[PDB]
Amino acid sequence: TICPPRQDYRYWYFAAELTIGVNYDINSTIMGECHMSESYIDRNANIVLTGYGLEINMTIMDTDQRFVAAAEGVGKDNKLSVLLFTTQRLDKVHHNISVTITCMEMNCGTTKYDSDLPESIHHKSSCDITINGSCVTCVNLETDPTKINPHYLHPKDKYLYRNSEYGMRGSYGVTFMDELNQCFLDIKEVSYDICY
Amino acid sequence: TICPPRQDYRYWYFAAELTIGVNYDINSTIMGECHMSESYIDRNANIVLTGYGLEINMTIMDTDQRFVAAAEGVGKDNKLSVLLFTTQRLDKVHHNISVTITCMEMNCGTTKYDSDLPESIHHKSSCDITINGSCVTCVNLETDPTKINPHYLHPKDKYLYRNSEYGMRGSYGVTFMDELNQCFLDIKEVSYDICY
Amino acid sequence: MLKIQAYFNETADLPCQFANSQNQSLSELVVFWQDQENLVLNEVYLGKEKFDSVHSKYMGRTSFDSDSWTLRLHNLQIKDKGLYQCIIHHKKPTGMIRIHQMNSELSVLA
Amino acid sequence: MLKIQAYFNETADLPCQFANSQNQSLSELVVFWQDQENLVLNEVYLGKEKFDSVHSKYMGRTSFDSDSWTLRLHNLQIKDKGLYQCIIHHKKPTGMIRIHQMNSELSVLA
Ligand SMILES: *[C@@H]1O[C@H](CO)[C@@H](O)[C@H](O)[C@H]1NC(C)=O
Ligand SMILES: *[C@@H]1O[C@H](CO)[C@@H](O)[C@H](O)[C@H]1NC(C)=O
Ligand SMILES: *[C@@H]1O[C@H](CO)[C@@H](O)[C@H](O)[C@H]1NC(C)=O
Ligand SMILES: *[C@@H]1O[C@H](CO)[C@@H](O)[C@H](O)[C@H]1NC(C)=O
């Protein structure tokens, strides 16, 4: 339980998801747009994935997990859903998270938001969100999801697990428009091409 | 809003158009004649595109835009229409413009015109035109056009936007022959091959 | 974690147990109650009830209480069993941050 | 930014509001009024009216005024609704530079 393996490529997956609602125009998945880089070296898990017009930089503090892979898709009304697959869960401690969304096309800018999301669903963890640019209208982050994370359950060889205990899921959210709760739903024309 | 991205190639376009009426003979588009070079480094946008018999050197002062691409076509009665696609508009300030048209085939010469065009349609911006040679009979420049800029709306992957507010369009013009107003019309046998 | 059972065509109450650690007021907060299809039920915008998006079926049937933070729903039906959510938002000048969510489930005799 | 409405088969006036910041004279400037098909209506070449290109339909039906800089057009028709332009050129020794343009739109009862 103490250690993670530190392998090359993982046959065993997990889940954690988020969705960004952006105002410029996205039509459909491009099958090869996403590109991700992962790291664990510092004791904190981290993943920066650059996609359709923004780079998402996510970090977990005191994690004992490392992002194995990710997937990204586009739905209706200019939403961008990114699923993140981490290795395996060794403990229940409700880590903090830090996410920065930087707009790299059609609305660049300097920082427009630097607050923290309380997440009083259980009120144990806090996420710090930093947005560079103006290409954001909604941000939702679901940690330890209970929905059907697997896209095309399952890739040819890998095995995938998903949390089934309500006490561990957390939801962080921030919106600038009016009442956009449940910013998007999973099973749709979403194509979900693998993020690499 | 503050910044432009400074990317490699842009999926997001805009518009600004012009037409040069030359006296030597041009039949039809050659599908690969144009060649353009763009720059932004100095704080001022610039594009020099060399084509059928003349090089057009356009520059925008205090712009916050960079020329993404261009297209060029030939119509009836020896006209040459060049469309210019810039990244995106961050502000409404009515920039000045500087354009030099240099004849490189069949009428070369030294400078024959070095005045400025007032553009009292709103009377806020001024363009400085310099013509080297004698291969010009009309010059028209429409900034922030409202017509159907897109040729073959739209290229396979790119997205394109066009101004729809009358208060921002400007028209600069200079003619040496007699009453050649509206020097040419868009939708015709114009082929509009991409400028590169 | 809060399951509510009601007798046939009985009335229902949906609470969502907001701790309110900061001791805030309803004028600086907004609340939505929504069903499993994402259709809204009621809304208290800055403290005043708004009915700009409630589907007709839910119009008037819901009532709100200040001290108890509970939604009272009448006229139960066999087909109204499902999940319900209490999303609470804090309307700061910059934007709205979600500071509470509670899932509840209700079922009827069959 | 100037829309003109006229009663059925009423007379029409097209102004184009030249500021004339430099206080120039009509003899050093030329004015064209043109319709949406680019066919000319009237022309004041160096101050004297010229009618070398007006289409017969527009011949005579138009009149000009010096102080008001307005084109008076008679005999409106249901099919004459559309856009019109006041292109003003300054005839320097070297060339003509466009120093004013004003779009206008006119419609008729239907
Ligand atoms: C990702 O974010 C962390 C801190 O949030 C930062 O140190 C790191 O440089 C970022 N990565 C990139 C590629 O910008
Ligand atoms: C392994 O078996 C499980 C259940 O039988 C299945 O979900 C999974 O896709 C299988 N994986 C492979 C690589 O066969
Ligand atoms: C384009 O014009 C600018 C100034 O108008 C000049 O500095 C530059 O050298 C020109 N480019 C070329 C290729 O001649
Ligand atoms: C994207 O969709 C818009 C409208 O649906 C369309 O105009 C554009 O051509 C599309 N672009 C691509 C690459 O599909």
Curated annotation (Swiss-Prot), chains C, D:
Domain Ig-like V-type: from-to ranges: 9-107
Compartments in which it is found: Cell membrane
Post-translational modification: Polyubiquitinated; which is promoted by MARCH8 and results in endocytosis and lysosomal degradation.
Tissues/organs with expression: Expressed by activated B-lymphocytes and monocytes.
S-S bridge residues: 16-86
Residues modified by glycosylation: 9, 23
Highest taxon of the lineage: Eukaryota
Function: Receptor involved in the costimulatory signal essential for T-lymphocyte proliferation and interleukin-2 production, by binding CD28 or CTLA-4. May play a critical role in the early events of T-cell activation and costimulation of naive T-cells, such as deciding between immunity and anergy that is made by T-cells within 24 hours after activation. Also involved in the regulation of B cells function, plays a role in regulating the level of IgG(1) produced. Upon CD40 engagement, activates NF-kappa-B signaling pathway via phospholipase C and protein kinase C activation.
Subunit structure: Homodimer. Interacts with MARCH8. Interacts (via cytoplasmic domain) with PHB1 and PHB2; the interactions increases after priming with CD40. Interacts with CD28. (Microbial infection) Interacts with adenovirus subgroup b fiber protein.
Name the UniProt record assigns to this protein: T-lymphocyte activation antigen CD86
Lineage: Eukaryota, Metazoa, Chordata, Craniata, Vertebrata
Whole-protein coverage range: 26 to 134 of 329
